[PDB]
Design a protein around this nucleic acid. Structure first.
Ligand SMILES: [Zn+2]
Lengths: 493, 128, 286, 125, 486
DNA sequence: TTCCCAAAAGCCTAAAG
DNA sequence: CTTTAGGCTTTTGGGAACTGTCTACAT
RNA sequence: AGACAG
């Protein structure tokens, strides 16, 4: 070929994204700060421990983690363990850190752990097998699905659904949406579902709830059941949130009311808890909000600081997403390209369980022996790796007969349902409003690149995608123009 | 089709300890060679290792120089690759802290050779 | 216681042881018672208571396982259920059928070993097999037949082929021994129940692959030839018990060992004859 | 050029058997030990045995599945191949008088398991 | 005439065994020796994840030779039989304890479990054993509560001996009011016709091959359903492994517990290891893993040929016709069978004139046929043409051709296109099987199965041939008829 | 996972001693 | 009048393509 | 049970 021709072809060609071509997992896992030499995984571990540090008994400080010497790495991998110094001969690309805690200024036994040590091109070698580490396209703060607001926490994976209900106002029948959410996992007379207003009435008094979350008063315009009790509200101080509370109240009361004899007991709390008495579950739900969720909700445009504020926002501001949603599940803009949160799901779960089962024992003095036993039983060597090859669907087996990492290696995205992969499910992908055509594919993902994994364009990643810091999918302006028009046609009626 | 010849890289793994010993497939009566050297060519019948189970009572039957060269398709364990395929390299792992060496004397020449080279390489890495 | 146881559951483990448851418761218761118661214381317171313680114781025881690893019970989750366990057999059955049909002939295999063998010896050995097939086959016979016939018949097949094939191979090996001159060992082939300096040097030259031995009290020891221990095993097997001869009368007369009582007296210088047989096999092979 | 270039052909006159007599899959060490794969292909599935039972009488199909399932029948087939002046065009592979039907391992297992429950499938009289 | 199920009298099977009868009652367990003997009789063990070498062996792994066939092993008092052809017989037996009248047939237990056993109450358990705890006020149903009340008011004794001895009256009461409520006529007739076979004295514990334990690094892999069976047997062991002899009521309770464990085991095993998509009936009883079978990419011959003509390649021909080549080598050349296998395997990846001549002579000696008869399968098997007979005619001399020259005409009968699809090939080992397969030969799908007098569309010529015929016939190489005449 | 479809549970209503 | 039969509505559970290759698996 | 081939 003419060298000048190749030069002009290069000049008249847009370059790809070095962030995405060289491996986005590489950047989000194995990138060192210049001020201090610390990987992204190490910083993520420090962030998780700093978040969980609120649950320490005043002196169990988490000092940090260090990088283990390969001398110590080999000594710790190959332990005695009943007179058999067992070693696994395999490439097994890994690196060891040690988490160090402090108690009143004195060191404990450091807990060593192993970490994947991704290579360029999203490549790892685990137990002698070459795996490809793909990012997971996640929703930033919460997802809107067919009829649901799906919000994940560190522990729970909650879903906010809604139904319709009837109530009489001024003698005329009216219909309002009641928003519910099953939270007691063991849960799975008309059968009803746990309304959010039911949780409000279970925690606070009914009059207390109305006064605290609205400028509305309650007696015992007029609101009454359909098919006794009477709730009277000032003629001018009305709101949609108060009406939703009334609808949820009647939804929880109309089917049950064999336990309602004196209406004044409705202002109490034990009666509502009986109607729903797992006070441990109630307290976990109350203190079931963490820093990462709050930060993500702030990023999206919500101002949650307490879970009750979250319930108020969902009941008043985010309920718009339940019946007529401005955003759509079909698109892929405004989404994160998360890697660590899914790779370290095992480690995140281990840290959470350690914290909870450590706070739940006692609030008394802690001995060094008991702390060491807890750390030994919590932070093992392969805590974050035992389930990498079986429980994580973002790590696939590499079978690329090419020298190019773009075509199959570095351009794979995995949906959350396909990311877990522990379900072993098949949604049939046809009767799904999620997998509809959207112009977002053309900018995020590759249409006409249709593997049997995801036959639509969401399976792979568009290599020119503009992705900013912290793995947020940004929108390139220019093509956006054309893209906008296409979207309208996709919804032509 | 000559212009389109894919290149295929393959790895053959064989374990020989107290269970079995390598046969002689790339050496004459004088020189014992279990597997091809680096840069060597596999036999016209692609066969490597061909390890035979170790039995003392069958010594004058399956340990004579003719029996070592001869391969019985049944009762022996060979790894069969593409014939004429040039050998890229060999990786040798040895457990050197067994007082009775399971491999009888004579059939550990190339093994010790490559293991010594690899040991020097890793020792130099460790020294660095 | 128862219751416681128842509650627781148881586981398985327881168963383981065985036882038843128832027873346881018772035882436781016883234881417681024883233881416681016783122781315681018562018173115281512280312590514791017683118751517581117782318761625781128862638871523780128851558871144980826791404490222481091993010796624990795990319920595997099983592309079907019968073939869910990875435990195969080392040998294809068709190879065994072929080796049976092969060993059913003796003249071809004998001429494969040595072309210069009279057929009258083969006929006498087959006539003796026609009577000897009722009784049992003993390990020394199989070992000698494996040693003598490996240039035409694999040794390990002797552990898979049927009894009639083993009897025919014993007849062929006895004929080969009788022709070679090792009549004493040939006598010990179709039977019913009822190393010197020059040899060492020659066998070491013929069998350069020798078993390594443990260093005694720190000082390393010289290796021991595997053919030597095989010869010792055959010698011990032959001297294990007394025997009744069921074979050709001509070979029995040539053996220079005749006893009025219906017992096959083992010659004092039998290990030397076995060593000579092994030396002849080694010379023939290499 | 693409992958799936071939070289995965699996021709097997006779396949090594499990202790419970039935052909099995090939483990890595035992699959990399033969020139070309030596797998026992499941060319008689439910659909294939349906087509055979319908197009041909169930007799020959049961005979094929008995030769495959019963190790003695397969040994007889190989013996017939080896002990014939013409290995091709063998008059009868398995002499059913010497080897009667009903010796197939899966069917014997099924019948024994039912008999341990107190039942047995038998033809109507 | 059909195929129905028949109840088997376990007493007849026990009497017809006439061999080494060892009972599971006499395993006191709780010690190394008896536990090891029980593990030898039960628990077919695979010590390591490695291929075994004992083609023929006894119950113990001590007689590794195969010529000792039918020799009773002194250690086990069991004859030596082929491992693959080992007879499938009940491993153990269970007899009635010293204070139990008889044993209930497991089929009867499973049949009664469908109706008597209920979530809110276990009628069979209440009727049979005494150590059953229940609360009447805890019954959250109404029909079940009424059934329980009626049963309580009737007032039967809760002993196993009473249940067995007075089974007629108890069963009639179960029929009468509401207890089964369906299939009354069939079940009553079944009980009336096979009453004697429902209470056998002896009960067989299934074969050693039924229960598999595979020991390996990280423990000993077992199955789930086996567990139930184990418990049942262990229960009967605990009947006799008691320091203090059990009272007759306790013996009846333990016997009923063991019988219920057997019933649960058989139900679960029939639901899981047979009924499921992978299993015994739907995986092995109707075809699995043929021998003398090959599978290869279909590349064909675009040459003047026959439709019943197939070309198996060098490697497939050598491995598939392994014993045919061995027979030819032994018959012609003074070669031992070991040398024959060595030659054949050595010359699979390499070409020679001798083996090619042997293939040609085999195909020629297949006299009243084009070659060696065989069946050819395309998956999924939808139509008659998915499976079709062909005749092998020539192994290809090119070692690089791992291809299978099926005829062009027979392509449309399956959905076979040369886009990189592997098809299956089964070698017919008999002339009788070839004659039987002649009904699956391609000439059977010529006539359309959906049109009265029409040849099926599967016989239509392929694309290139049709286009060639078009470009030849439909050409203006002559003037029109009027101009041709004028 | 979600849709198919049969079988057992459960419920109101009705007929005979 | 009391005590069960009968048929309709709920709830639950087994089941959901064929062949072949490869991949995963102790603490 | 995930991918791939048809
Ligand atoms: Zn035995």
């Amino acid at each position: 070929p003419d060298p000048f021709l190749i030069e002009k072809i290069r000049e008249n060609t847009p370059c790809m994204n070095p962030t995405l071509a060289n491996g986005i997992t590489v950047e989000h896992t194995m990138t060192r700060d210049p001020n201090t030499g610390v990987n992204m995984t190490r910083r993520y571990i420090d962030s998780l421990f700093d978040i969980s540090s609120v649950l320490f008994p005043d002196g169990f400080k988490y000092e940090g983690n260090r990088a283990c010497t390969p001398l110590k790495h080999f000594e710790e991998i190959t332990r005695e363990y009943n007179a058999k110094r067992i070693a696994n001969i395999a490439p097994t690309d890994m690196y060891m850190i040690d988490l160090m805690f402090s108690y009143k200024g004195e060191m404990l036994y450091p807990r060593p752990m192993l970490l994947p040590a991704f290579k360029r091109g999203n490549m790892v070698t685990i137990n002698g097998a070459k795996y490809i580490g793909s990012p997971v396209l996640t929703d930033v703060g919460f997802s809107v699905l067919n009829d649901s607001i799906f919000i994940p926490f560190r522990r729970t994976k909650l879903t906010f659904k809604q139904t319709d209900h009837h109530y009489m106002c001024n003698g005329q029948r009216k219909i309002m949406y009641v928003i519910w959410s099953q939270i007691h996992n063991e849960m799975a007379r008309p059968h009803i579902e746990s309304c959010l207003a039911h949780y409000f009435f279970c925690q606070f008094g009914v009059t207390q709830t109305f006064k605290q979350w609205a400028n509305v008063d309650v007696k015992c315009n007029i609101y009454s059941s359909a098919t006794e009790m009477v709730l009277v509200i000032p003629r001018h101080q009305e709101s949609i949130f108060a009406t939703r509370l009334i609808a949820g109240f009647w939804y929880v009361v109309d089917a049950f009311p064999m336990r309602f004899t004196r209406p004044e007991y409705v202002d109490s709390t034990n009666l509502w808890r009986v109607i729903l008495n797992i006070d441990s579950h109630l307290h976990s739900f109350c203190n079931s909000l963490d820093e990462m969720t709050i930060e993500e909700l702030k990023t999206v445009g919500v101002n949650v600081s307490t879970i009750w504020e979250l319930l108020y926002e969902i009941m008043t501001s985010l309920a718009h997403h339940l019946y007529a949603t401005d955003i759509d599940e079909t698109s892929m803009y405004g989404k994160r390209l998360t890697v660590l949160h899914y790779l370290m799901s095992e480690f995140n779960y281990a840290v959470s369980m350690f914290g909870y089962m450590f706070q739940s024992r006692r609030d008394r003095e802690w001995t060094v022996q008991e702390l060491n036993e807890g750390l030994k039983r919590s932070f093992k060597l392969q805590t974050a790796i035992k389930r990498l090859t079986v429980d994580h669907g973002e790590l696939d087996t590499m079978s690329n007969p090419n020298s190019s990492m773009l075509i199959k290696g570095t351009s794979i995205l995995v949906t959350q349902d396909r990311a877990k992969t522990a379900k072993a499910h098949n949604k049939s992908l046809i009767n799904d409003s999620s997998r509809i055509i959207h112009a977002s594919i053309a900018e995020v993902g590759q249409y006409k690149n249709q593997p049997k994994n995801n036959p639509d364009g969401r399976g792979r990643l568009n290599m020119y995608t503009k992705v900013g810091p912290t793995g947020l999918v940004e929108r390139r302006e220019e093509v956006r123009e054309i893209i906008d028009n296409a979207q309208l046609m996709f919804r032509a009626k | 089709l000559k212009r389109m010849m894919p290149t295929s890289y393959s790895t053959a793994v064989a374990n020989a300890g107290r269970k079995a010993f390598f046969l002689n497939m790339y050496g004459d009566d004088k020189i014992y060679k279990p597997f091809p050297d680096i840069g060597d060519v596999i036999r016209p019948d692609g066969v490597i290792f061909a390890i035979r189970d170790h039995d003392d009572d069958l010594a004058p039957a399956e340990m004579t120089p003719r029996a070592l060269r001869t391969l019985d398709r049944t009762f022996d364990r060979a790894v069969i690759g593409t014939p004429g395929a040039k050998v890229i390299d060999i990786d040798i792992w040895r457990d050197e802290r067994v007082n009775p060496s399971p491999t009888p004397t004579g059939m550990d020449a190339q093994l010790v050779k490559y293991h010594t080279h690899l040991s020097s390489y890793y020792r130099e890495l460790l020294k660095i | 216681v128862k219751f416681c146881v128842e509650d627781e559951a148881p586981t398985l483990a327881n168963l383981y042881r065985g036882m038843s448851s128832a027873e346881v418761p018772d035882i436781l218761q016883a234881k417681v018672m024883v233881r416681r118661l016783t122781i315681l214381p018562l018173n115281d317171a512280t312590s514791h208571s017683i118751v517581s313680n117782m318761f625781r114781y128862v638871k523780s025881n128851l558871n144980p396982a826791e404490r222481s690893t091993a010796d624990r019970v795990n319920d595997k989750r099983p592309t079907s259920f019968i073939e869910s366990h990875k435990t195969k057999q080392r040998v294809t059955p068709g190879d065994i059928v072929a080796y049976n049909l092969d060993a059913l002939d003796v003249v071809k295999l004998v001429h494969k070993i040595d072309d210069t063998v009279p057929v009258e010896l083969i006929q006498e050995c087959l006539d003796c097999v026609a009577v000897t097939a009722t009784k049992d086959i003993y390990p020394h016979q199989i070992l000698l037949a494996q040693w003598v016939m490996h240039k035409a018949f694999p040794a390990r097949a002797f552990s898979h082929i049927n009894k009639n094939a083993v009897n025919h191979l014993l007849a062929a090996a006895q004929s080969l021994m009788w022709h070679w001159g090792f009549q004493q060992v040939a006598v010990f082939m179709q039977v019913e129940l009822y190393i010197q300096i020059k040899y060492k040097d020659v066998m070491d030259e013929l069998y350069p692959h020798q078993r390594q031995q443990r260093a005694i009290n720190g000082v390393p020891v010289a290796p021991v030839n595997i053919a030597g221990i095989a010869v010792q095993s055959a010698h011990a097997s032959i001297r294990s018990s007394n025997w009744i001869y069921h074979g050709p009368d001509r070979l029995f007369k040539e053996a220079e060992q005749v006893t009025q009582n219906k017992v096959l007296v083992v010659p004092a210088t039998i290990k030397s004859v076995i060593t000579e047989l092994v030396i002849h096999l080694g010379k023939l092979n290499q | 050029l693409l992958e799936k270039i071939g070289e995965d052909w699996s021709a097997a006159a006779s396949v090594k058997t499990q202790p419970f007599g039935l052909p099995s899959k090939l483990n890595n060490a035992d699959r990399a030990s033969t020139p070309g794969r030596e797998t026992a292909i499941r060319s008689f599935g439910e659909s294939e045995t349906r087509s055979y039972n319908c197009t041909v009488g169930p007799g020959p199909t049961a005979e094929i599945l008995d030769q495959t399932n019963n190790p003695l029948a397969h040994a007889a087939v190989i013996e017939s191949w080896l002990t014939a002046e013409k290995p091709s065009s063998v008059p009868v592979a398995v002499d059913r008088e010497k080897i009667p039907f009903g010796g197939s391992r899966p069917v014997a297992m099924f019948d024994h398991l039912l008999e341990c429950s107190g039942i047995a499938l038998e033809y109507a009289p | 005439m059909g195929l129905y199920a028949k109840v088997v009298d376990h007493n007849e099977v026990h009497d017809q065994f006439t061999g080494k009868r060892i009972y599971a009652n006499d395993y006191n367990t709780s010690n190394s020796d008896e536990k090891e003997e029980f593990d030898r009789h039960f628990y077919s063990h695979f010590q390591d994840s490695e291929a075994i070498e004992s083609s023929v062996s006894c119950d113990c792994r001590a007689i590794e030779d195969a010529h000792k066939l039918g020799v009773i092993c002194d250690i086990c008092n069991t004859p030596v039989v082929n491992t693959s052809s080992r007879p499938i017989e009940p491993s153990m037996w269970v007899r009635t304890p010293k204070h139990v009248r008889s044993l209930i047939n497991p089929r009867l237990i499973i049949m009664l479990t469908g109706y008597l056993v209920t979530k809110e109450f276990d009628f069979l358990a209440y009727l049979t054993d005494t150590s059953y705890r229940y609360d009447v006020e805890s019954i959250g149903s109404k029909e079940t509560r009424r059934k329980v009340d009626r049963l309580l008011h009737r007032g039967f004794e809760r002993g196993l001996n009473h249940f067995i001895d007075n089974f007629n009256e108890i069963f009639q009461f179960l029929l009468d009011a509401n207890i089964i409520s369906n299939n009354k006529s069939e079940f009553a007739q079944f009980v009336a016709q096979n009453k004697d076979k429902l209470f056998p004295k002896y009960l067989p514990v299934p074969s050693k091959l039924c229960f598999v334990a595979e020991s390996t690094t990280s423990g000993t892999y077992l199955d789930k359903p086996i567990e139930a069976a184990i418990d049942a047997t262990l229960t009967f062991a605990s009947i006799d492994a008691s320091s203090v002899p059990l009272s007759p009521i306790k013996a009846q309770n333990r016997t009923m517990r063991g019988l219920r464990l057997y019933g649960q085991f058989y139900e679960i095993y029939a639901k899981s290891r047979i009924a499921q998509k992978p299993g015994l009936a739907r995986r092995h009883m109707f075809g699995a893993r043929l021998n003398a079978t090959a599978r290869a990419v279909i590349t064909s011959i675009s040459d003047p040929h026959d439709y019943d003509e197939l070309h198996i390649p060098w490697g497939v021909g050598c491995q598939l016709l392994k014993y045919h080549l061995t027979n030819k080598l032994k018959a012609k050349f003074n070669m031992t069978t070991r040398e024959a296998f060595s030659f054949v395997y050595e010359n699979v990846l390499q070409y020679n004139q001798i083996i090619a001549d042997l293939f040609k002579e085999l195909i020629a000696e297949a006299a009243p046929y084009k070659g060696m008869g065989c069946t050819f399968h395309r998956n999924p098997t939808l139509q008659r043409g998915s499976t079709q007979q062909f005749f092998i005619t020539k192994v290809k001399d090119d070692i690089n051709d791992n291809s299978i020259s099926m005829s062009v005409l027979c392509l449309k009968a399956p959905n076979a296109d040369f886009d990189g699809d592997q098809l299956n090939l089964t070698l017919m080992p008999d002339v009788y099987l070839t004659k039987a397969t002649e009904r699956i030969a391609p000439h059977t799908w010529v006539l359309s199965i959906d049109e009265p007098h029409e040849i099926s569309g599967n016989l239509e010529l392929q694309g290139p041939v049709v286009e060639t015929i078009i470009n030849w016939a439909h050409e203006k190489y002559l003037p029109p008829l009027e101009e041709w005449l004028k």
